[PDB]
Each structure stands twice: as C-alpha cells, then as structure tokens.
Amino acid sequence: FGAISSVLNDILSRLDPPEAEVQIDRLITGRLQSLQTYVTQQLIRAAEI
Amino acid sequence: VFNATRFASVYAWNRKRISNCVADYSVLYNSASFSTFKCYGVSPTKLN
C-alpha cells in the first residue's frame, strides 16, 4: 500500500515514531479497507443462504 | 575512511566496500566535527 515493507516489525526496528506513524497509517488504511470488503461480501452471501 | 590524508575528485568519487566488522556507529553519530549528518532509509539512532 505504498509502505516500505509489508512486515510490521521491520518498520518498528528501523524507524523513529513520528514517521513510523506515517507508514503505519497507510498500512492500516489498506488492510481495514480489505476487511470491510470481505465482511460486505460475507453479508450478501449470508442473505442468499 | 574519515581521517584520510587526501580524497579524490567528485567526478572520480572514491568507493570502498566495507565488510566483516562490528561497526559501532554511535561515536560517528556523536562527532560534532561533521556538520551535516542525516539519514534517509533509517532513523540514525537505530544503527547500533
């Protein structure tokens, strides 16, 4: 999602928090959007079932 | 590397491959004789 890495601990082992937060913001935004997509599709399938 | 007698030119910039040591960056972090000291991929304090 634009971050330097896909693994959380590598940023934390490398960065100082006032830019690590700038990276983690991107990470949680992308993952939260994916989770929202999953739950919406699950709701629709559950209605059909 | 740092206390060298003589450098080369910018168009003949000197490259050295450093390998096989325990580099201890905090003293080079701590020397105030170096005016501009700034890092891009890594926060400088985590180098230890």
Cα–Cα distance measured from residue B47 to residue B22, given in angstroms and rounded to the nearest whole number: 11
Whether residues A13 and B42 touch (CB distance < 8 A) is answered with no
Whether residues B45 and A19 touch (CB distance < 8 A) is answered with no
Task: Establish how many alpha carbons lie within 13 A of residue A31's alpha carbon, considering only the half-sphere containing its beta carbon.
Answer: 10
Residues in chain A after which the chain is broken, C→N over 2.5 Å: none
The DSSP H or E segment spanning B12 is: none
Q: How were these coordinates obtained?
A: cryo-EM
Residues of A in contact with B45 (CB under 8 A): 16
- Strand, coil or helix: B17: coil
- Residue B46: name the closest of A12, A27, A7 by CA: A12
Buried b / exposed e over A22-35, threshold 16 CB at 10 Å, is ebbeebeeeeeeee
CA–centroid distance for A27 within its chain: 4
**What separation in angstroms does the CA of A30 have from each of A3, A33, A38, B23?**
10, 5, 13, 37
**What separation in angstroms does the CA of A27 have from each of A5, A16, A48, B31, B40?**
9, 16, 33, 36, 20
The rounded radius of gyration (Å) of the Cα atoms in chain A is 15
- For testing contact with chain A, the best of B29, B42, B43, B47 (most A CBs within 10 A): B43
